[PDB]
Coordinates of C-alpha atoms and ligand atoms in Angstrom, one line a residue:
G1 CA -49.8 32.7 -4.9
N2 CA -52.9 30.5 -4.2
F3 CA -52.8 31.2 -0.4
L4 CA -55.9 30.1 1.6
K5 CA -55.0 32.1 4.6
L6 CA -52.9 35.3 4.9
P7 CA -52.0 37.4 8.0
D8 CA -53.3 40.9 8.3
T9 CA -50.0 42.7 8.1
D10 CA -48.4 45.3 5.9
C11 CA -44.7 44.8 5.7
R12 CA -44.5 47.9 3.4
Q13 CA -46.0 50.1 6.1
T14 CA -44.1 48.5 9.0
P15 CA -41.0 46.7 7.9
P16 CA -40.6 43.9 10.5
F17 CA -37.1 43.4 11.7
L18 CA -37.5 39.7 12.4
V19 CA -40.2 37.4 11.1
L20 CA -40.7 34.0 12.8
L21 CA -42.2 31.2 10.7
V22 CA -43.2 28.4 12.9
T23 CA -43.9 25.0 11.5
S24 CA -46.4 22.8 13.3
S25 CA -49.1 20.3 12.4
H26 CA -52.8 20.8 12.7
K27 CA -53.3 19.1 16.1
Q28 CA -50.4 21.0 17.7
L29 CA -52.6 23.9 18.9
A30 CA -51.0 23.5 22.4
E31 CA -47.6 24.1 20.9
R32 CA -48.8 27.2 19.0
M33 CA -50.5 28.6 22.1
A34 CA -47.4 28.1 24.3
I35 CA -45.4 29.9 21.6
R36 CA -48.0 32.8 21.3
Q37 CA -47.7 33.2 25.0
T38 CA -43.9 33.1 25.1
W39 CA -41.1 33.8 22.5
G40 CA -43.8 34.3 19.8
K41 CA -45.5 37.3 21.4
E42 CA -45.1 40.2 19.0
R43 CA -43.3 43.2 20.3
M44 CA -40.5 45.7 19.9
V45 CA -37.2 44.2 20.7
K46 CA -34.7 47.0 21.2
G47 CA -37.1 49.1 19.0
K48 CA -37.1 46.5 16.2
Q49 CA -40.4 44.9 15.2
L50 CA -40.9 41.2 15.7
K51 CA -43.7 39.3 13.9
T52 CA -44.7 35.6 14.3
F53 CA -46.7 33.5 11.9
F54 CA -47.5 29.8 11.9
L55 CA -47.3 27.7 8.7
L56 CA -50.0 25.2 8.1
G57 CA -51.2 23.1 5.2
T58 CA -54.5 21.3 4.9
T59 CA -55.9 18.1 6.4
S60 CA -58.5 15.5 5.5
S61 CA -60.1 15.7 8.9
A62 CA -63.0 18.1 8.9
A63 CA -62.8 18.7 12.7
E64 CA -59.1 19.8 12.4
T65 CA -60.0 22.0 9.4
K66 CA -62.6 23.8 11.4
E67 CA -60.4 24.1 14.5
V68 CA -57.8 25.7 12.3
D69 CA -60.2 28.0 10.5
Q70 CA -61.4 29.2 14.0
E71 CA -57.8 29.6 15.1
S72 CA -57.1 31.8 12.1
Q73 CA -60.1 33.9 12.7
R74 CA -59.3 34.4 16.3
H75 CA -55.5 35.0 15.9
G76 CA -55.0 36.2 12.3
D77 CA -51.4 34.8 12.3
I78 CA -51.7 31.6 10.1
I79 CA -50.2 31.2 6.6
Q80 CA -51.9 28.4 4.7
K81 CA -51.8 26.8 1.3
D82 CA -53.8 23.7 0.1
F83 CA -51.3 20.9 0.4
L84 CA -51.7 17.8 2.6
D85 CA -50.0 18.7 5.9
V86 CA -47.9 15.7 6.7
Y87 CA -44.2 15.1 7.7
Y88 CA -43.2 14.2 4.2
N89 CA -44.6 17.4 2.8
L90 CA -42.5 19.6 5.2
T91 CA -40.6 20.9 2.1
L92 CA -43.8 22.3 0.6
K93 CA -44.5 23.9 4.0
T94 CA -41.1 25.5 4.1
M95 CA -41.4 26.7 0.5
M96 CA -44.8 28.1 1.4
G97 CA -43.2 30.2 4.2
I98 CA -40.4 31.3 1.9
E99 CA -42.9 32.2 -0.9
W100 CA -44.8 34.3 1.6
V101 CA -41.7 36.3 2.5
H102 CA -41.1 36.8 -1.2
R103 CA -44.6 37.9 -2.2
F104 CA -45.8 39.7 0.9
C105 CA -42.9 40.6 3.2
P106 CA -39.8 41.2 1.2
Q107 CA -39.0 44.1 3.6
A108 CA -38.2 41.7 6.5
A109 CA -34.6 42.3 7.5
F110 CA -34.4 38.7 8.9
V111 CA -36.5 35.5 8.9
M112 CA -36.3 32.6 11.2
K113 CA -37.9 29.2 10.3
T114 CA -38.4 27.2 13.5
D115 CA -40.0 24.0 14.8
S116 CA -42.7 24.0 17.4
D117 CA -40.8 22.2 20.3
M118 CA -38.3 25.0 20.6
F119 CA -37.1 27.7 23.0
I120 CA -36.1 30.8 21.0
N121 CA -34.3 33.7 22.6
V122 CA -35.3 36.6 20.4
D123 CA -33.6 39.3 22.4
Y124 CA -30.2 37.7 22.2
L125 CA -30.7 36.8 18.6
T126 CA -31.6 40.4 17.8
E127 CA -28.4 41.5 19.6
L128 CA -26.2 39.0 17.6
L129 CA -27.8 40.0 14.3
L130 CA -27.2 43.7 14.8
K131 CA -23.7 42.9 15.8
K132 CA -23.0 40.7 12.7
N133 CA -23.4 43.5 10.1
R134 CA -24.4 40.8 7.5
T135 CA -27.6 42.2 5.9
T136 CA -27.8 40.3 2.5
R137 CA -27.2 36.8 1.3
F138 CA -26.9 35.8 5.0
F139 CA -27.8 32.3 6.3
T140 CA -27.0 30.8 9.7
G141 CA -28.1 28.3 12.4
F142 CA -26.6 25.0 13.4
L143 CA -24.3 24.2 10.5
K144 CA -24.3 20.7 9.2
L145 CA -21.4 20.6 6.8
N146 CA -20.6 17.0 5.9
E147 CA -23.8 15.0 6.3
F148 CA -24.5 11.7 4.9
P149 CA -28.0 10.7 3.9
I150 CA -29.7 8.2 6.2
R151 CA -30.0 4.9 4.3
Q152 CA -31.7 2.9 7.2
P153 CA -35.1 2.2 5.6
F154 CA -37.1 2.6 8.8
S155 CA -35.4 5.7 10.2
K156 CA -37.6 8.7 10.3
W157 CA -35.1 10.6 8.1
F158 CA -34.5 7.7 5.6
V159 CA -34.1 8.7 1.9
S160 CA -33.7 6.1 -0.8
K161 CA -31.0 6.3 -3.5
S162 CA -33.7 7.3 -6.0
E163 CA -35.0 10.0 -3.7
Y164 CA -31.4 11.3 -3.2
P165 CA -28.7 9.5 -5.1
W166 CA -25.5 11.0 -3.9
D167 CA -23.1 10.2 -1.0
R168 CA -23.2 13.5 0.8
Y169 CA -25.7 16.2 1.4
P170 CA -24.9 19.8 0.6
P171 CA -24.1 22.1 3.5
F172 CA -27.3 23.0 5.3
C173 CA -28.6 24.1 8.7
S174 CA -30.8 22.1 11.2
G175 CA -34.5 22.8 10.4
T176 CA -35.0 23.0 14.2
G177 CA -34.3 26.7 13.7
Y178 CA -32.4 28.6 10.9
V179 CA -32.2 32.4 10.2
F180 CA -31.6 34.3 6.9
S181 CA -31.7 37.8 5.6
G182 CA -35.0 38.5 3.9
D183 CA -33.6 38.9 0.4
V184 CA -32.6 35.2 0.6
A185 CA -36.2 34.2 0.5
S186 CA -36.7 35.7 -3.0
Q187 CA -33.6 34.0 -4.3
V188 CA -34.5 30.7 -2.9
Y189 CA -38.0 30.9 -4.2
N190 CA -36.7 31.9 -7.6
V191 CA -34.4 28.8 -7.9
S192 CA -36.6 26.3 -6.1
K193 CA -38.2 24.9 -9.2
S194 CA -34.8 24.1 -10.8
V195 CA -33.3 22.3 -7.8
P196 CA -33.7 18.5 -7.3
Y197 CA -36.6 18.0 -4.9
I198 CA -36.0 16.2 -1.5
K199 CA -38.5 15.7 1.2
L200 CA -36.2 16.9 4.0
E201 CA -36.9 20.7 4.0
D202 CA -33.6 21.9 5.6
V203 CA -31.6 19.8 3.1
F204 CA -33.7 21.2 0.2
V205 CA -33.0 24.8 1.3
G206 CA -29.4 23.8 1.4
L207 CA -29.5 22.7 -2.2
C208 CA -31.0 26.0 -3.2
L209 CA -28.4 28.0 -1.2
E210 CA -25.7 26.0 -2.9
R211 CA -27.1 26.8 -6.3
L212 CA -27.2 30.5 -5.4
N213 CA -23.5 30.4 -4.1
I214 CA -24.9 31.6 -0.7
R215 CA -22.4 30.2 1.9
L216 CA -23.4 29.2 5.4
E217 CA -21.9 31.2 8.3
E218 CA -21.8 30.9 12.1
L219 CA -23.8 33.6 13.9
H220 CA -21.3 34.1 16.7
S221 CA -18.0 32.9 18.0
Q222 CA -19.8 30.7 20.5
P223 CA -22.5 28.1 19.5
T224 CA -26.0 29.5 19.9
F225 CA -28.3 26.9 18.2
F226 CA -28.8 23.6 20.0
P227 CA -30.7 20.9 18.0
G228 CA -29.6 18.4 20.6
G229 CA -31.2 20.2 23.5
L230 CA -29.7 21.6 26.6
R231 CA -29.6 21.3 30.4
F232 CA -31.6 24.4 31.4
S233 CA -30.2 27.3 33.4
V234 CA -31.4 30.9 33.3
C235 CA -27.8 32.1 32.6
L236 CA -27.3 29.7 29.6
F237 CA -30.7 30.5 28.2
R238 CA -29.9 34.1 28.3
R239 CA -26.9 33.6 26.0
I240 CA -28.3 31.1 23.4
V241 CA -30.6 31.6 20.4
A242 CA -32.5 28.4 20.0
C243 CA -32.9 25.1 21.9
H244 CA -34.8 22.0 20.7
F245 CA -36.7 19.2 22.6
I246 CA -38.9 21.6 24.6
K247 CA -42.5 20.6 25.1
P248 CA -45.2 23.2 25.7
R249 CA -45.4 22.8 29.6
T250 CA -41.6 23.1 29.7
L251 CA -41.6 26.1 27.4
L252 CA -43.9 27.9 29.7
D253 CA -41.9 27.0 32.8
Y254 CA -38.7 28.2 31.2
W255 CA -40.3 31.4 30.1
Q256 CA -41.6 32.0 33.6
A257 CA -38.1 31.3 35.0
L258 CA -36.6 33.9 32.7
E259 CA -39.3 36.4 33.8
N260 CA -38.9 35.6 37.6
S261 CA -35.1 36.1 37.3
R262 CA -35.0 39.2 35.2
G263 CA -32.9 41.9 36.8
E264 CA -30.6 39.5 38.6
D265 CA -27.1 39.3 37.1
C266 CA -25.4 36.3 35.6
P267 CA -21.5 35.9 35.7
Ligands
LIG1 O1 -38.4 17.7 6.6 C1 -37.0 17.6 7.2 C2 -36.8 17.7 8.7 O2 -35.4 17.5 8.9 C3 -34.8 17.6 10.1 O3 -33.4 17.8 10.1 C4 -32.7 16.6 9.9 C5 -31.5 16.6 10.8 O4 -30.9 17.9 10.6 C6 -30.6 15.4 10.4 O5 -30.3 14.8 11.7 C7 -29.6 13.6 11.4 C8 -28.5 13.4 12.4 O6 -27.3 14.0 11.9 C9 -26.2 13.8 12.7 O7 -25.1 14.5 12.2 C10 -26.4 14.4 14.2 O8 -26.5 15.8 14.2 C11 -27.7 13.9 14.8 O9 -28.0 14.5 16.0 C12 -28.9 14.0 13.8 O10 -30.1 13.4 14.3 O11 -31.3 14.5 9.6 C13 -31.8 14.9 8.4 C14 -30.8 14.6 7.3 O12 -30.5 13.1 7.4 C15 -32.3 16.4 8.5 O13 -33.4 16.5 7.6 C16 -35.3 18.9 10.9 O14 -34.9 19.0 12.2 C17 -36.8 19.0 10.8 O15 -37.3 20.3 11.5 C18 -37.3 19.0 9.4 O16 -36.8 20.1 8.7
LIG2 C1 -48.3 16.5 -0.4 O1 -49.4 17.3 -0.7 C2 -50.0 17.1 -2.0 C3 -51.1 18.1 -2.2 O2 -52.1 17.9 -1.1 C4 -50.5 15.6 -2.1 O3 -51.0 15.3 -3.4 C5 -52.4 15.0 -3.3 O4 -52.6 13.8 -2.6 C6 -54.0 13.5 -2.5 C7 -54.1 12.3 -1.5 O5 -54.2 12.8 -0.2 C8 -54.5 13.1 -3.9 O6 -55.9 12.8 -3.8 C9 -54.3 14.3 -4.8 O7 -54.7 13.9 -6.1 C10 -52.9 14.8 -4.8 N1 -52.7 16.0 -5.6 C11 -51.5 16.6 -5.8 C12 -51.6 17.8 -6.6 O8 -50.5 16.1 -5.4 C13 -49.3 14.7 -1.7 O9 -49.8 13.3 -1.6 C14 -48.7 15.1 -0.4 N2 -47.5 14.2 -0.2 C15 -47.5 13.2 0.6 C16 -46.2 12.4 0.8 O10 -48.5 12.8 1.2
LIG3 C1 -20.2 45.8 12.9 O1 -19.9 47.2 12.7 C2 -19.6 47.8 13.9 C3 -19.4 49.3 13.6 O2 -18.6 50.0 14.5 C4 -17.8 50.9 13.8 O3 -18.0 50.8 12.3 C5 -17.4 49.7 11.6 C6 -17.7 49.9 10.1 C7 -15.9 49.5 12.0 O4 -15.2 50.6 11.4 C8 -15.8 49.4 13.5 O5 -14.4 49.2 13.8 C9 -16.3 50.7 14.2 O6 -16.1 50.6 15.6 C10 -18.3 47.2 14.5 O7 -18.0 47.8 15.8 C11 -18.5 45.7 14.7 O8 -17.3 45.1 15.1 C12 -19.0 45.1 13.4 N1 -19.4 43.7 13.6 C13 -18.5 42.7 13.8 C14 -19.1 41.3 14.0 O9 -17.3 42.9 13.8
MN4 MN1 -38.7 18.8 16.7

């Protein structure tokens, strides 16, 4: 698949239950390290295998390139392809991750694509996934069902009419963090080249799911994905899946809080 870097992992030998694909830019080593030290640490979660990989492209900067080659050598958990890693190539990045699942890890029961400034509660997500009994053509997160493209030309999410010419976006899930059964990766990759491109990755995946007739569903009767962020409490964070707007220091403090308070009960 023209991959420059691949993780040493055999999904055939050890079918992972949950694969996390974390998008971050080259300079966000602090983010990736905070994640490797917290929700990204690989482990058995109720006897299910959790794997974590970081999605990177390439950069002009020779310094950053070397940093990243060193990071890959030292951690063996980077997935890389040769595309200029910038905000407006995030769709390539996402399709890279999806391609990886399709070519090298089709045995993953579930896959989560997430941002770097996130708290992810893998234990509770594992619990909700086992409860859901939806093992194929499954896709969830924070549902965005009737979104209008941003036409303000200076907004970070601006798309012109020629980039996306219709009034509404298909249904999609916030790219802060979305989860799908592993089969979905193959289907999305298969259709990706026949779907109109758009530089917003979560919208693009929504276009593919719509072409595949894969409908978005809520993970649980209570909201569990929070792109807007949350006021922190140990008891709320024990009963959510994902929370955005979390910088590395904060991520570590919250992780420490959840450790310090383990074993205490919450109403
Ligand atoms: O490469 C794409 C990039 O997209 C990011 O998602 C974007 C947001 O989901 C969305 O937010 C616009 C706006 O929508 C309102 O309904 C409210 O929910 C408000 O809070 C929100 O800010 O904007 C665009 C579509 O216009 C989406 O792409 C995503 O978070 C990134 O990780 C990345 O995937
Ligand atoms: C997305 O990545 C592609 C691949 O890296 C970029 O395309 C290249 O851009 C460089 C400029 O940095 C050119 O020298 C190459 O000729 C281009 N090649 C190809 C195959 O595209 C593309 O520019 C990136 N997208 C954005 C918006 O920067
Ligand atoms: C997932 O499946 C669970 C299985 O429990 C037993 O088997 C299923 C097929 C039903 O017959 C159920 O009534 C049995 O107790 C269910 O308990 C569980 O409710 C299912 N998940 C959801 C979200 O409903
Ligand atoms: Mn973010």
